[PDB]
Amino acid sequence: APGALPTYWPWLCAAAQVAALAAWLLGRRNL
């Protein structure tokens, strides 16, 4: 679907992984 102007994918892709890592890492927080 060209014509559009995508320019917010990088924060979203990071928001996805950051959600997975932050979820596991949240288990620690006891160092």
PDB file of C-alpha atoms in Angstrom:
ATOM      1  CA  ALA A   1       0.000   0.000   0.000  1.00  0.00           C
ATOM      2  CA  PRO A   2       2.431   2.716  -1.196  1.00  0.00           C
ATOM      3  CA  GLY A   3       1.305   6.378  -1.360  1.00  0.00           C
ATOM      4  CA  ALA A   4       1.273   6.357   2.462  1.00  0.00           C
ATOM      5  CA  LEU A   5       4.217   7.819   4.472  1.00  0.00           C
ATOM      6  CA  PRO A   6       5.351   5.226   7.071  1.00  0.00           C
ATOM      7  CA  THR A   7       7.797   6.784   9.584  1.00  0.00           C
ATOM      8  CA  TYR A   8       7.100   5.165  13.002  1.00  0.00           C
ATOM      9  CA  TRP A   9       8.055   1.496  12.458  1.00  0.00           C
ATOM     10  CA  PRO A  10      11.510   1.648  14.191  1.00  0.00           C
ATOM     11  CA  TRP A  11       9.991   2.625  17.592  1.00  0.00           C
ATOM     12  CA  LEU A  12       7.288  -0.052  17.088  1.00  0.00           C
ATOM     13  CA  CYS A  13       9.715  -2.872  16.189  1.00  0.00           C
ATOM     14  CA  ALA A  14      11.719  -1.833  19.255  1.00  0.00           C
ATOM     15  CA  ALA A  15       8.497  -1.640  21.299  1.00  0.00           C
ATOM     16  CA  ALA A  16       7.886  -5.316  20.418  1.00  0.00           C
ATOM     17  CA  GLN A  17      11.314  -6.679  21.419  1.00  0.00           C
ATOM     18  CA  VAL A  18      11.613  -4.250  24.357  1.00  0.00           C
ATOM     19  CA  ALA A  19       8.308  -5.788  25.532  1.00  0.00           C
ATOM     20  CA  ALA A  20       9.758  -9.330  25.369  1.00  0.00           C
ATOM     21  CA  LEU A  21      13.141  -8.495  26.942  1.00  0.00           C
ATOM     22  CA  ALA A  22      11.576  -6.186  29.572  1.00  0.00           C
ATOM     23  CA  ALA A  23       9.197  -9.065  30.424  1.00  0.00           C
ATOM     24  CA  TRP A  24      12.004 -11.569  31.085  1.00  0.00           C
ATOM     25  CA  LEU A  25      14.378  -9.001  32.600  1.00  0.00           C
ATOM     26  CA  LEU A  26      11.511  -7.960  34.909  1.00  0.00           C
ATOM     27  CA  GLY A  27      11.958 -11.424  36.460  1.00  0.00           C
ATOM     28  CA  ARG A  28      15.447 -10.476  37.693  1.00  0.00           C
ATOM     29  CA  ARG A  29      15.651  -7.054  39.373  1.00  0.00           C
ATOM     30  CA  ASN A  30      17.358  -8.737  42.367  1.00  0.00           C
ATOM     31  CA  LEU A  31      21.066  -8.294  41.542  1.00  0.00           C
TER      32      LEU A  31
END
